[PDB]
Write a protein that binds this ligand. Structure first.
Ligand SMILES: CC[C@H](C)[C@H](NC(=O)C[C@@H]1NC(=O)[C@H](CNC(=O)[C@@H](N)CC(=O)O)N(Cc2ccccc2)C1=O)C(=O)NC(C)(C)C
Ligand SMILES: [Ca+2]
Ligand SMILES: [Ca+2]
Ligand SMILES: [Ca+2]
Ligand SMILES: [Ca+2]
Ligand SMILES: [Ca+2]
Ligand SMILES: [Ca+2]
Lengths: 210, 210
């Protein structure tokens, strides 16, 4: 019985049927089913159960892929006279991802510096966010960066730009002047689903140098 | 075969193995597998394929639960001499949800009115959004309403509140007067994951009457 697959964060009610395990050797007589493993009889206990009589395997609560992503259980079958009628059968349960984590910036405030008269197209600094969701299988961790605001808006509103992919911030125009406008405070955003998804912001403060 | 489950919006590469179908007639000799159904040989065509010889059921592109959430296919098995060696076996494929739809308000502009006598706690009007994601199994369509802004901001900034579950808007404070301010324009928001998720905005326009 190949990998069972359950999404994290499912609504109730619980418990919920996954799949029905059965033994050939029951047409002889009555069979009792049980499970072992982490998730069953070792911690966390009781997340998966199995009906002793019917062999229905159930999940009893919501799962969390970022806490546990896979479970390995073993299925047991015992005759009514008390003997195992099978070797224990391995069961694999795979927990599939929901986009339940916002991107998080590695800092609240990133700090950088830029020289007056820096060529337009000069890289200044890099901001960085991570996302705890599943980046191999989904777009739930796929981060795009944007700039939301610049303060002050002088001498131009859009002195800087950010590479959507790498989070690298560049100077895009001219007229840096530390004696009139000594810093720039940018609000930066990171959003998963390639920009369309959940979002967080942080701040980048750029000091203008000689 | 219990249901096969595949998440929507999976990354590649494709195609992806789902599960291997087999017959016992393997032993007797060569068998060739095929599938029929909507999703296989009728529209949409070729989303699922089966490997003629190995019996690997595959999916050939990212799925979209909001187009089709459940497929019903039938597997066929045929000897290399060209006779059906089984009855067609039904196969169920469930597409599990990602949160890839924002809520949408039923209108862009909701209208309501409220007598200027109105006591705090008086219901004015109701806004309403839908969400196309899976409202039975997930929270991905679990919408909470909020107010974002009010124009004008007099005689107080927050003349109204909104029930975050039902979207019923109510008077929350005193000092309504048609003569001085006959019209309020609220921006309302609907967000899924019980408020924490994807979001959208509309407008509510409230007229003060005598
Ligand atoms: C995600 C859980 C899903 C929601 C759930 N479905 C299930 O529990 C069945 C579950 N589905 C599967 O596809 C996996 C097979 N494994 C894989 O698909 C990946 N591990 C490999 C991959 O395809 O990437 N199996 C085993 C299997 C499947 C078919 C036939 C024989 C064995 C299942 O038994 C369900 O129906 N939910 C409702 C109630 C319909 C909404
Ligand atoms: Ca989680
Ligand atoms: Ca995420
Ligand atoms: Ca997740
Ligand atoms: Ca979709
Ligand atoms: Ca969806
Ligand atoms: Ca949604």
């Amino acid at each position: 019985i190949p990998p069972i697959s359950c999404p994290e964060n499912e609504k109730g009610p619980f418990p919920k049927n996954l799949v029905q395990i059965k033994s050939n050797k029951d047409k002889e007589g009555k069979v009792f089913y049980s499970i072992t493993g982490q998730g069953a009889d070792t911690p966390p206990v009781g997340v998966f159960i199995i009906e002793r009589e019917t062999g229905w395997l159930k999940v009893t609560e919501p799962l969390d892929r970022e806490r546990i992503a896979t479970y390995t259980l073993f299925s047991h079958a015992v005759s009514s006279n008390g003997n195992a009628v099978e070797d224990p059968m391995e069961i694999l349960i795979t927990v599939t991802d929901q986009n339940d984590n916002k991107p998080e910036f590695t800092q609240e405030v990133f700090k950088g510096s830029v020289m007056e008269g820096a060529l337009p197209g000069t890289s200044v600094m890099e901001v960085t966010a991570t996302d705890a969701d599943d980046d191999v299988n989904t777009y739930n961790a796929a981060i795009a960066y944007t700039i939301l605001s610049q303060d002050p808006e002088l001498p131009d509103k859009n002195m800087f730009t950010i590479n959507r992919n790498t989070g690298v911030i560049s100077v895009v125009t001219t007229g840096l002047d530390r004696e009139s406008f000594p810093t720039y405070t940018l609000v930066v955003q990171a959003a998963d689903l390639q920009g369309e998804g959940l979002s967080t912001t942080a701040t980048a403060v750029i000091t203008v140098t000689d």
